[PDB]
């Protein structure tokens with residue numbers, strides 16, 4: 001079968017300050033789920049073997065994809081069977097695919113965990129550690145709850161300054177998932193450059209959650225270190241704890257706290273986000289996100305109101321943001 | 331339901347002069363309808379409420395969309411019901427959506443009304459007054475013929491020179507539509523800049539038509555004023571009258587006259603366009619457009635032979651153009 | 661009917677040297693068939709007349725179409741019937757459409773015939789002689805084996821230096837095709853520029869093949885001359901002979917030899933490619949290509965490992981390449 005699918009998630013959003021201390025408001029996107037358009041298919045080859053493909057790109061409903069539509073979210077071909085699944089092509093790397101599942105705000109909107117970000121202003125295409133070009137991944141079956149994923153992305157001799165392997169990824173995870181309980185440990189290294197100097201991006205991530213039915217609790221710890229070959233490092237420890245709960249048959253409330261300990265500037269930022277999702281149907285929801293981000297000292301982090309304002313703020317400033325929108329899946 | 335749809339409209343076209351006085355001919359597009367590719371869907375949410383989405387982009391069949399496919403024609407999500415319809419996302423603004431309906435050449439090809447154009451070389455993304463980014467619109471039901479539409483597009487602090495609200499749109503229309511008779515009054519203001527100086531783009535548009543069955547008569551008047559905050563204005567009055575008629579069961583003839591009174595250069599341009607559409611089926615037509623554009627004095631307007639030549643001509647020159655093509659809808 | 665179709669063909673690839681003499685390896689694409697995504701449709705208009713359209717673009721699975729999706733492979737509208745077929749829009753020109761059919765590696769991957777390439781560093785959009793913007797083509801029916809195709813692409817006064825008709829194409833072919841036997845003669849001229857000086861790109865191509873069932877033999881000869889108006893020429897004679905055979909019910913082996921006699925640098929390059937395709941189903945195949953390219957003297961040609969390395973090599977160097985991949989059609 002071949003399936004056309006997508007999501008259009010568009011919102012109004014506001015932040016009280018930008019890099020100049022001025023408020024911003026506007027029409028933005030992707031507050032509850034990332035807006036997307038894709039095609040996927042699966043073919044039974046017999047003998048339990050299946051071939052697949054998946055082409056997916058982000059949608060920007062506020063500007064009609066003004067910078068041009070692509071398939072940067074995923075563009076894979078695969079084989080799958082009793083051995084698991086092997087995929088070739090651009091995709092989420094295994095470490096982000098698995099560990100972002102512990103973020104109650106699904107790595108989008110103003111609310112989400114910010115650990116997967118380019119903390120060091122690395123010069124690679126994907127120094128947020130989320131996706132990779134030139135990726136091969138292998139995902140095992142789940143046996144008795146245990147499951148794992150592994151990926152390698154080729155650098156293809158991409159060269160920036162003294163780095164001649166920019167974009168290489170090697171990484172994977174081990175996990176236990178039984179339904180209500182989930183826990184995962186991810187480890188990855190990317191090759192990059194910072195200021196034209198070869199640098200490793202090392203990331204270790206631990207996540208766990210338990211779904212009690214009446215509520216779900218979820219936590220994530222992560223250390224990301226950009227270690228420059230000649231010496232020096234930009235190290236960040238990121239922490240998150242959240243809870244969600246169904247409210248009355250068609251609603252869901254979510255609350256998440258995060259802390260970002262940015263060692264290179266000896267500064268912390270703390271974040272609290274409250275969210276609500278109200279389902280009008282299985283495919284259509286209204287939602288609201290309210291977030292507060294407190295930078296200390298030299299920290300300049302800003303909330304990610306996509307399509308409105310997602311830059312930084314002045315050092316040590318607190319920022320408040322709101323998003324209210326509709327998400328429609330098809 | 332989700333519907334894939336589109337139009338491929340490709341033509342041969344000719345103009346007798348360009349900005350150097352040389353003829354041009356070629357393979358162009360979109361002479362009878364704008365070529366497009368889109369997806370749209372509607373979901374019944376119960377209780378008379380519906381959710382929708384619509385993603386549509388222009389097609390350029392002469393070059394395979396060489397500059398890259400996007401969804402700039404419309405990228406909305408909506409809710410609709412007995413209250414009307416609310417849409418979020420890039421789209422036609424209500425004033426252009428409603429008032430371009432009075433142009434017998436459908437705001438495309440060499441023939442159409444040129445009132446919705448960037449008369450002042452405004453620096454905004456959409457200073458032709460046709461579409462807007464970051465748009466929210468509301469369309470009422472039609473009650474007893476009466477209907478209205480309203481839109482607001484956020485500027486998001488887009489800054490060019492002394493303008494810090496570039497791209498803002500506020501506008502709407504009131505109308506009467508009973509089938510044979512249609513009349514509408516539109517009013518809109520956009521924020522922009524001209525030469526780096528903050529400028530309002532003010533537009534008032536009146537249109538009416540009557541469909542007698544054997545023929546249709548249609549007219550449009552418009553004043554567009556770019557009023558610069560420090561003083562000065564580029565004002566243009568635009569007028570059009572046209573008629574169409576079915577010819578023999580599968581044909582249609584169209585004739586339209588327009589005048590553009592460009593106050594800032596004390597010059598007028600007059601235009602006459604004759605068109606014919608021959609239906610081979612409900613979805614496939616052959617067509618021809620013949621146009622004559624007479625610039626007086628300092629006027630340099632040119633016919634819009636998309637994909638062939640759509641620039642200006644030398645001051646005071648007359649230009650003739652022809653387009654012959656096929657339009658295929660799917 | 662309207663049909664969505666495509667191919668995702670992604671591979672691992674290696675070449676032993678690049679322009680610096682270093683090996684390269686990576687995740688690439690399109691080793692067995694060019695990866696693509698398209699929509700096409702046909703409408704019966706009655707009386708044996710049909711309207712069609714076809715929109716197709718290349719897919720780059722290794723990077724998610726990072727530079728943006730388009731319809732550059734084909735974006736046509738057509739009419740067809742007992743007279744043949746007329747198409748308007750960007751497409752393969754008739755000479756490449758017909759003559760590339762003699763290449764056993766289908767003008768893609770490391771293995772294919774390289775005759776359709778920009779031998780002179782022409783400055784036109786399509787100086788490889790493969791596709792054209794602004795194209796009108798006519799294809800006859802096949803009567804008693806005989807068939808022909810003709811195309812004209814408008815230049816639209818595209819100007820580069822002293823060339824004011826850049827991109828013009830005039831060309832066509834005559835052929836005999838009866839099933840097992842195929843032979844074709846193509847002739848074409850394009851207008852271009854080299855170093856800002858007007859230049860004709862003249863191409864004559866002869867191809868033939870015979871399919872014995874147990875094996876197929878195929879050959880191609882081509883002369884491409886870039887003849888500069890003020891004098892001088894970059895002339896290349898290109899030759900290829902290949903064979904293919906089914907192996908055991910789901911396999912196919914292919915072997916092709918080519919020679920490129922580059923007169924402007926008095927140098928030859930020779931190429932040998934071995935390929936295997938193993939079908940897992942009618943739509944899904946695994947494949948491998950192994951190629952050896954020997955440059956003599958000043959020749960610097962390189963193998964085309966798309967998405968890994970497709971540049972040149974140092975003068976007189978031999979290069980080896982390998983591609984192993986999966987092709988999945990839908």
Ligand SMILES: CCCCCCCCO[C@@H]1O[C@H](CO)[C@@H](O)[C@H](O)[C@H]1O
Nearest residue numbers: 004069332333334369399662663664
């Ligand atoms: C950027 C280009 C967007 C590609 C849009 C893909 C449209 C697919 O269209 C879909 O596919 C199937 C085949 O027609 C059908 O089942 C459905 O009618 C349709 O929903």
Ligand SMILES: [Ca+2]
Nearest residue numbers: 052053054078
């Ligand atoms: Ca897949």
Ligand SMILES: [Ca+2]
Nearest residue numbers: 027062307464
């Ligand atoms: Ca916006």
Ligand SMILES: [Ca+2]
Nearest residue numbers: 382383384408
């Ligand atoms: Ca909609």
Ligand SMILES: [Ca+2]
Nearest residue numbers: 357392637794
């Ligand atoms: Ca053109």
Ligand SMILES: [Ca+2]
Nearest residue numbers: 712713714738
């Ligand atoms: Ca066609």
Ligand SMILES: [Ca+2]
Nearest residue numbers: 068069398728
């Ligand atoms: Ca694009």
Ligand SMILES: [Ca+2]
Nearest residue numbers: 134687722967
């Ligand atoms: Ca690659």
